[PDB]
């Protein structure tokens, strides 16, 4: 198992952010995806999205309410999510955690997401 995300993305504020994740494995069924957020300048992280067995599970982080959608396809080894109407409160590091049985405990990749003035 190997997990890729871009190192950085820049998103114009008010537009949709695409958090790309691609992985390699020998998929679907037991495989799961979690995404977490570390707000810039905090040392804590919020888990806010989880996907297994065709079902989306959403954490309660008010900045992400009504913004998070699954954009992946496990068969295509894509674990991406979209984030609507991105604003400066969404600046920080996004962390994708992919578990594929069998792997010992899974793998993670980080995106530093910079929201940028659309003006």
Residues in the chain: 119
Contact criterion met (CB below 8 Å) for 75 and 64: no
Q: Are 87 and 13 in contact (CB under 8 A)?
A: yes
Residue 88 DSSP code: G
The DSSP line for 78-114 is B--EEESS--GGG-EEEEEEEE-SSSSS-EEEEEEEE
Q: How far apart are CA 45 and CA 36, in angstroms?
A: 6
Structure determination method: X-ray
Contact 109, 95 (CB under 8 A): yes
Residue 108: count other Cβ atoms within 10 Å of its Cβ: 13
What is the architecture, at CATH level 2, of domain 1-119?
Answer: Sandwich (2.60)
Q: What is the DSSP string of 37-85?
A: EEETT-S--EEEEEEETTEEEE---GGGTTTEEE--BGGGTB--EEESS
Domain residue ranges in the chain:
1-119
Q: Tokens 């067995």 belong to which residue?
A: 53
Distance CA 14, CA 113 (A): 14
Q: With CA atoms as reference, report the closest residue to 25 among 63, 70, 77.
A: 77
């Amino acid at each position: 198992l190997e997990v890729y995300t871009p190192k950085e993305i820049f998103v114009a504020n008010g537009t949709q952010g695409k958090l790309t994740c691609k992985f390699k494995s020998t998929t679907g069924g037991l495989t799961s995806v979690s995404w977490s957020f570390q707000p810039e300048g905090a040392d804590t992280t919020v888990g806010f999205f989880h996907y297994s067995q065709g079902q989306v599970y959403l954490g309660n982080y008010p900045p992400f309410k009504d913004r998070i959608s699954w954009a992946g396809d496990l068969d295509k080894k894509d674990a991406s999510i979209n984030i609507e109407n991105m604003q400066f409160i969404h600046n920080g590091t996004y962390i994708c955690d992919v578990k594929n049985p069998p792997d010992i405990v899974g793998k993670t990749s980080h995106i530093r997401l910079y929201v940028v003035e659309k003006e």
